[PDB]
Structure 1
Amino acid sequence: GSHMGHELAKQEIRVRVEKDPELGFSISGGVGGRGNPFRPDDDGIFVTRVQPEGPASKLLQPGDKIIQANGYSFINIEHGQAVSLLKTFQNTVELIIVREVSS
């Protein structure tokens, strides 16, 4: 796993980002996708950057794993599909994320 001999606690969190009109964060990942620096063997979609003083600054953090966005599943999704879907979203994006919480 990502950590040697232990696994961090996980919290599922629901947040709403108001696009302004941009997301205010960047992603990487996906099945057969661009990878990620958090859980490198996990093919999920991860937040890689959060725009300072942007619409996600109080809500998201690097390393958050997006598992659902506006009712669409981001599990087994490809990078391009995730990017395309996020792009179609006009204003509010309701995300379900998994955040690792160190002890």
Structure 2
Amino acid sequence: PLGSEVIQALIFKDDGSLGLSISGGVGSSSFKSGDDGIFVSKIAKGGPCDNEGTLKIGDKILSVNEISFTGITHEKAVEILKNQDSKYMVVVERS
């Protein structure tokens, strides 16, 4: 997208959670018109994502720990984000 920026955040799980919610994915209703991507749709107050402070509602997730989130389902996105790691390098596209 014109004027878009690519941002990265390193977030550590606390009690098994990153403190954010996702929407979208291939095979789901699109969060943004015409974009089947995975998007940050909620950030829990006082959670790890809020504390680190880099990510924002509306960010499109491009990768997590170098796993591409382009062309993946909501279900696959969730599996990855619920995996056994505690450390997540999240790359997003902000528009």
Does TM, scored on the shorter chain, surpass 0.5? Answer: yes
CA contact (8 A) 1:31 1:44 kept: yes
Distance in 2 (alpha carbons) for counterparts of 1:80 and 1:44 = 12
Question: Once superposed, what is the RMSD of the aligned Cα atoms?
Answer: 1.3
Distance in 1 (alpha carbons) for counterparts of 2:18 and 2:45 = 12
Task: Tell me the equivalent position of 1:3.
Answer: none
Distance in 2 (alpha carbons) for counterparts of 1:18 and 1:89 = 12
Distance in 2 (alpha carbons) for counterparts of 1:59 and 1:17 = 9
What's the offset of the Cα at 1:34?
3.7
Q: Which runs of 5+ in 1 are unaligned?
A: 1-6
Distance in 1 (alpha carbons) for counterparts of 2:9 and 2:37 = 18
Deviation per CA, 1:64-98, whole angstroms, max 9, x where unpaired?
00010011110000110000111114211101100
Task: Tell me the equivalent position of 1:73.
Answer: 68
Task: Tell me the equivalent position of 1:40.
Answer: 33
Q: Displaced runs of 4+ in structure 1, greater than 3 A?
A: none
Distance in 1 (alpha carbons) for counterparts of 2:26 and 2:4 = 21
What's the offset of the Cα at 1:15?
0.7
Larger radius of gyration: 1
Q: 1:19 aligns with which of 5, 13, 24?
A: 13
The answer to which of 73-82 and 25-34 deviates more is 25-34
Task: Tell me the equivalent position of 1:9.
Answer: 3
TM-score for both structures, normalised by structure 1: 0.83
Q: How many residues are matched?
A: 92
